[PDB]
Amino acid sequence: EPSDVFIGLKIDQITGINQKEENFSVVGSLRIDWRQPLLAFEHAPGEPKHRTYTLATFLKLLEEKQIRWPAFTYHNQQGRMDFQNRLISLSEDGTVMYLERFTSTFQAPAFDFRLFPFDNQLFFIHVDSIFPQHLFRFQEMQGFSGLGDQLGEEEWIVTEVNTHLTTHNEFTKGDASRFVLEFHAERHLNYYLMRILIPVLLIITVSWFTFFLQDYTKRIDLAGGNLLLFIAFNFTISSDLPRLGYITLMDAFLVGTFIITALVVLGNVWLRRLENHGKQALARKLDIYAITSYPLAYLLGALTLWLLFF
Amino acid sequence: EPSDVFIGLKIDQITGINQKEENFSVVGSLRIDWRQPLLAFEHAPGEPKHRTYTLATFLKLLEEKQIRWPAFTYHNQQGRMDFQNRLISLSEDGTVMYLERFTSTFQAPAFDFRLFPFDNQLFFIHVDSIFPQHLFRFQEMQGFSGLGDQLGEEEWIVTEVNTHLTTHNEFTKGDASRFVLEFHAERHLNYYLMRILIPVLLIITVSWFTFFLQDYTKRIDLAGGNLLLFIAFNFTISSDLPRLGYITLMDAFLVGTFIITALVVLGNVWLRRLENHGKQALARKLDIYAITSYPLAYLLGALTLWLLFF
Amino acid sequence: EPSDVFIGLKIDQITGINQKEENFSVVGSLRIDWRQPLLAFEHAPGEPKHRTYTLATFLKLLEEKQIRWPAFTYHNQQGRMDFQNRLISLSEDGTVMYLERFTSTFQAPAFDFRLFPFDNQLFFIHVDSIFPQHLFRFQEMQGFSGLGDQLGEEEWIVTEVNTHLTTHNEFTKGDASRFVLEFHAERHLNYYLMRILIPVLLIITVSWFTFFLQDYTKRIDLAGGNLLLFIAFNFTISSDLPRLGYITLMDAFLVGTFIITALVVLGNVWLRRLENHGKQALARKLDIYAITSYPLAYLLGALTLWLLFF
Amino acid sequence: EPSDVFIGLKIDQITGINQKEENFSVVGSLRIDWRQPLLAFEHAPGEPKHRTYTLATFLKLLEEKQIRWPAFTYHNQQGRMDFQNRLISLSEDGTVMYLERFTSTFQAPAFDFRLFPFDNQLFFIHVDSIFPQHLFRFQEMQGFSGLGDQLGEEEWIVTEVNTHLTTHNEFTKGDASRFVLEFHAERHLNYYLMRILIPVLLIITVSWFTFFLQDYTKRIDLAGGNLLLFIAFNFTISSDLPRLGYITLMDAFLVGTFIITALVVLGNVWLRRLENHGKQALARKLDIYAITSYPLAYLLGALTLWLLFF
Amino acid sequence: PSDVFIGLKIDQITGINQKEENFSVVGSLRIDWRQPLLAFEHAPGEPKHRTYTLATFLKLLEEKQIRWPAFTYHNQQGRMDFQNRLISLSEDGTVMYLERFTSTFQAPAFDFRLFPFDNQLFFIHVDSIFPQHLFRFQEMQGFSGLGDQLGEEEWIVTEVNTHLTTHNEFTKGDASRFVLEFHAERHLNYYLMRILIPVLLIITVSWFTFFLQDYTKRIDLAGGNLLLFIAFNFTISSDLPRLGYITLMDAFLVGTFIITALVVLGNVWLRRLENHGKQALARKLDIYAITSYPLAYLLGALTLWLLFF
Ligand SMILES: CCCCCCCCCO[C@@H]1O[C@H](CO)[C@@H](O)[C@H](O)[C@H]1O
Ligand SMILES: CCCCCCCCCO[C@@H]1O[C@H](CO)[C@@H](O)[C@H](O)[C@H]1O
Numbered sequence A, B, C, D: 001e002p003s004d005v006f007i008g009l010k011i012d013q014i015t016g017i018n019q020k021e022e023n024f025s026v027v028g029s030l031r032i033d034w035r036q037p038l039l040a041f042e043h044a045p046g047e048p049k050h051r052t053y054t055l056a057t058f059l060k061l062l063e064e065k066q067i068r069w070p071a072f073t074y075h076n077q078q079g080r081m082d083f084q085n086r087l088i089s090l091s092e093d094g095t096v097m098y099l100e101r102f103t104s105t106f107q108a109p110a111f112d113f114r115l116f117p118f119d120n121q122l123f124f125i126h127v128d129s130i131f132p133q134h135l136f137r138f139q140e141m142q143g144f145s146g147l148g149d150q151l152g153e154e155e156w157i158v159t160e161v162n163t164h165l166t167t168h169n170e171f172t173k174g175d176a177s178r179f180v181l182e183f184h185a186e187r188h189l190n191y192y193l194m195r196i197l198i199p200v201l202l203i204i205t206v207s208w209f210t211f212f213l214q215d216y217t218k219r220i221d222l223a224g225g226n227l228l229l230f231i232a233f234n235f236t237i238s239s240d241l242p243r244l245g246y247i248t249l250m251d252a253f254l255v256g257t258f259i260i261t262a263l264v265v266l267g268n269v270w271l272r273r274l275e276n277h278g279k280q281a282l283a284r285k286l287d288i289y290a291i292t293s294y295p296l297a298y299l300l301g302a303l304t305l306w307l308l309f310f
Numbered sequence E: 001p002s003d004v005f006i007g008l009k010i011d012q013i014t015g016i017n018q019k020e021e022n023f024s025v026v027g028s029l030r031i032d033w034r035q036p037l038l039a040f041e042h043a044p045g046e047p048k049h050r051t052y053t054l055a056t057f058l059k060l061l062e063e064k065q066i067r068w069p070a071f072t073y074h075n076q077q078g079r080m081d082f083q084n085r086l087i088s089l090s091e092d093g094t095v096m097y098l099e100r101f102t103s104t105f106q107a108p109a110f111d112f113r114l115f116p117f118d119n120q121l122f123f124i125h126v127d128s129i130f131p132q133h134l135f136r137f138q139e140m141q142g143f144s145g146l147g148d149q150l151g152e153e154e155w156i157v158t159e160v161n162t163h164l165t166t167h168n169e170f171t172k173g174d175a176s177r178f179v180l181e182f183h184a185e186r187h188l189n190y191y192l193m194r195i196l197i198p199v200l201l202i203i204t205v206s207w208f209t210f211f212l213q214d215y216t217k218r219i220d221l222a223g224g225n226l227l228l229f230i231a232f233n234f235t236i237s238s239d240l241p242r243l244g245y246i247t248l249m250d251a252f253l254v255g256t257f258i259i260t261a262l263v264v265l266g267n268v269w270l271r272r273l274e275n276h277g278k279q280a281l282a283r284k285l286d287i288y289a290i291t292s293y294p295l296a297y298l299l300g301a302l303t304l305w306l307l308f309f
């Protein structure tokens, strides 16, 4: 028969979410409760009912007693797992109580940037049993798992936390236990608002003010430089994300500003071409269309993305 | 009955405060005094009264003697704790004297940037007992804890240091001991003064000098470029802080310079529109308002933030 | 006679491909099946048929029993290999079942950037036996090796995976076993399209629009600044790659835009020289060649690279 | 009575001096000579007179023999100390000869940037005895300590090296031994000359050449842009240093160039105001003061800092 | 003294960091050392070669009261990440040791005076802690050198050498030192494509505009060119340490500053002539201004080439 292994995982801290590398880093406590009757002991009156062991004088004790421990792996772990505590408390009964306090980076392969910066992402930790379900079965330790109240994350906001059990077939033919701690998080848009939206809108709005000067060459010079600024913002955005094979909402927004700016250059080239061919009165009458085209083009673009993405 | 565990923590160095990641790094010495009568030993005349042990031939000795040690965790620790010394001195009495010399990063979740750069922050180290208060009780080792006199921090300045004891319920149902070393620090404004305030004020002041040239087009070109400079300073500031979900005093200050610059472009567009419509004498008379508006707008903005934040 | 050592390697994650350092990083599981009759054991009825050991109480057991283990090296490994699990399961038969779960960077010396960004690269992991083929022979463990289905890589896309066995002569005179896990990957061009192709083409296209203004000095100023922008893009590209001794397709493309821009400056200098020497009507008639030269030069350049590289 | 512990420290390499973090990194060899009569041994003819031990089979031997070793700490150490060698040679007499070869970062709290880049700094390594002077007394091992002849540092130049012994009271009530290896280093100014002084002087000198063009508007545009360049150099300098609470010689120099540039804008605004009010002949006569003011202002500024700092 | 056979092979050059003057390699260290005291008797059927993990082998040496040839990688920096540390002990007492590692090593031989046309010396120093009366290092033949898949793209190894010398680090008397040395030169393609071609383009296309005959436009052009060169000056400085000496590249950039400064100065003079009603004079002299520019840069190029070669 298989022995129940009680898994508990609690994330105390979110040391950071690195979206360029699609991983996240946490400070967490792993807790296991496992009754092995073979590990039970007799104690004399006055002698302790609970034996405290350092993993691995405990592992050395299991090898001596020829006992198999529920060897597990953090399936989505990355790099070094820095440990704080690896402590065992063994009761008279044979109940092993294990605590693993660590700092570690975990793969975040659920990353979908299609609606960035208005995106919601799934983050998880996979705890897998190396041995199959006929030997060990993972159970949910109640009263433990979840996320703490001082995570330290400022950009992200955790919407919900879940825990569940599933099978995996990594090293075995037969099903093996897998404990899952999942959490969903959405973004605080303040950074994007203050650094990208407000500046891009300002550049567009104050550039439109200069249309009231009625100098077509000055408009052309202005839209030309604006195009370079947007190319620069394009690089600012691209630095936050991986080199994706798909278009983001932000990417569409920037390509949109390129297209409109390109057309602003094209249109004011036409009006100045009229002035150059002795048709200044015509260009001055059409100028109302040039002045009102600019806000309509950006308002048409904004409605196009909002439709294409929502 | 529970055994008193005497906790002492001393920060020798502040290797740095990383406000983007909301953590801090220290070189510290942890000192513990714990009397365990079971660890007492008899010595022969001439033989040593104090046994010196490396943790973990000492831990190996505790496991042998079936003794439980006051297992603790640095609750707000992050990543690897690099140790320099982990030494035990055991007296005939059974008094364990432990010294833990380490370098470590700790979570700084008390970070409030709302008044940045005029902010004061709380930094702490949490030392928690894994075992509850019925087994072990943390006591304040007197004559030890605090901060050193060569911390090596140049930007921050420590205003006060405190030590206190409280309960926690991390791994247990019942209350467990927690030692706290807390310190408050404020910022040296010289960097912000020299690199952000003086340059932003200079750009504004020398830009106003050119109003005395009486060229409205030149003013428009100047305010336009100034707006781009402020957008660049906006990115310079944002690089120092996390991607916060809230507005800082600095953020308000930069948004303020955007608004005024936007209006300077708008106003000088109007004056130049008057000149273009054969009303140069009118624009020249109103020019006194345009020239005196600029300093009043920035002085009105400065009083608005100072009221909105103080 | 030689003993068959069954090698299995599975890449769970591609933590990243760093093309500037020509290496890649993976999370992988190494699996070995090796029957050593000398390690066989007798067990009593009811006692376990499978002994579970931590490498290296298992290594300590081999040294005791004076047995030589199939010592191996990851030949193309770089830096620290962070281990998650190093576990042995020893059957009554003497069948050692070893699992090595690790995170590691590996040298990528197969990097050929000549057709970048339209390049396809070879990535491999070399597992070598330290002892020669007369002692140990590597065999392909079936049902294991390959790449997982949640690699987490966004820019690269794996085209095919292969496993094979070959000889090496690293530390021995005679041939020694080598297990090879190879994979080919091509690039998602979306990043290059959105950040380099679209911006470079936009700068060129909107710059051509201004030719319709018929101001030769303005064209010269525009081409001059465009040349500086391309020099800046040249640095943006160079930051992605190592300091190669050869020319890439991208390098040819940028040098191409330099040459054409240099000639645009040269040509419009000539047309403006005609206007300056009272030959404005001649320069205006030739202007059709100057306006249609620009698109033909870039279209001629594009066909030259496409021929020179394909 | 107390036992003499002979301390020797030799820095082989300066892997770098990081002035932003106020620390330095070295590759060093620590050498200790300590006679413990209790460790003396009898050897049979033919058997070795010197026993070679790995620290810590040697430490395991001390714990067995119930002997206390002169436990020490590198007081100003930071982070991980990567060890190369930790070897003991024990003579028949009981003379322990210890060698500790390591790479480590050390706190540099003596950093005074007030005269940067013409500054001279103190760098030290503190080796402290954990046990007081009644048990162990540190002595200077002669013929060892100092700095090597291939340190590998290119910017800094070591002026002098010193070694001395003092007391500390870190973990004890009574005085405890402290070994000090101190060195003074000054900076090679070539980087600052080539990248900051020559460029800033060039910008100022070639900008003055254009005064001979007699275009006041062109001067205003030039001084305005020069001010932006100095603001950029201001950021270039600030990146090298910590966010100090005090003004450096460099900071004064940059603030100086801001003030003069601000005044150049102010003065040429006045001359152009004269020209605009039909007083061109007056502005042309005064122009000699404007042309000779510029070099006098920068020469007056240079004498002010040189007095204020020397 | 007992002969200790040292062999060192660099499999990979993980990188050369010229700003920190160090280099990083993946290497295999191989030692052959006969200690008769370690010899063993084996029964028929029992193994003739005992395989040990360093340090059950070191634990065996301490037991047998034997001194091992303790060594240090003298020019090593930071952590040496090990892959393999394996011993094979023959019946004879021949210890066969293999040390597979990744490590950074100090490169103190760095001479940037002719950068980017420089050739540098890189080495690894393996020192015996014990003197030559106890242990003597010998060259293990058939092993040492550099591999054929080093993975370095900018540098090209010109030659590899191995030799033995003495050191006096921890002892009064001479102690053995094994040296693996290699010389490497640079692939100039990066400098050509990113620094030479752009700087020459800026200079050449800027000269084209002289044919416009607008002295103010030339002044504005040379002024901005000076700022571009100041920016390239920072681009170059980022690759190297904060040296106390001038490089060929530094001289080249200072050269472009001087010529650009003079271009501003000269066209200020020509425009001063035009402003003082002497346009026909400035137009005749303009041939000297137009032909001065290429001569100044060609004179500068010959000055550096002489001063450095
Ligand atoms: C740029 C946003 C602010 C617009 C307000 C109008 C005043 C002019 C601001 O300077 C402009 O900056 C562009 C970007 O570099 C240049 O291309 C352009 O020639 C220049 O006139
Ligand atoms: C900019 C602060 C200094 C102001 C002093 C007046 C002289 C002109 C300085 O150059 C100006 O720089 C702006 C920013 O890029 C450009 O938009 C603008 O067109 C340009 O004239």
Ligand SMILES: CCCCCCCCCO[C@@H]1O[C@H](CO)[C@@H](O)[C@H](O)[C@H]1O
Pocket: A220, A221, A222, A223, A224, A225, A227, A228, A265, C203, C206, C207, C210, C221, C222, C224, C225, C226, C229
């Ligand atoms: C630059 C791509 C957009 C071209 C559209 C035409 C309008 C002008 C845009 O500003 C231009 O930017 C160049 C780059 O800095 C300068 O050299 C040039 O003098 C300036 O006029």
Ligand SMILES: CCCCCCCCCO[C@@H]1O[C@H](CO)[C@@H](O)[C@H](O)[C@H]1O
Pocket: D203, D206, D207, D210, D221, D222, D223, D224, D225, D226, E219, E220, E221, E222, E223, E224, E226, E227, E264
């Ligand atoms: C700038 C140092 C070189 C001065 C030599 C005179 C020629 C003009 C160089 O270009 C100038 O660059 C400034 C900085 O951006 C701009 O503000 C200014 O309007 C522009 O004319």
Ligand SMILES: CCCCCCCCCO[C@@H]1O[C@H](CO)[C@@H](O)[C@H](O)[C@H]1O
Pocket: C220, C221, C222, C223, C224, C225, C227, C228, C265, E202, E205, E206, E209, E220, E221, E222, E223, E224, E225, E227, E228
């Ligand atoms: C700059 C190399 C290309 C030269 C070709 C001539 C066309 C003009 C290119 O723009 C120029 O860029 C300089 C650098 O910022 C400015 O100083 C200058 O005023 C501006 O006109």
Ligand SMILES: [Ba+2]
Pocket: none
């Ligand atoms: Ba401009």
Ligand SMILES: [Zn+2]
Pocket: B043, B049, B092
């Ligand atoms: Zn006593």
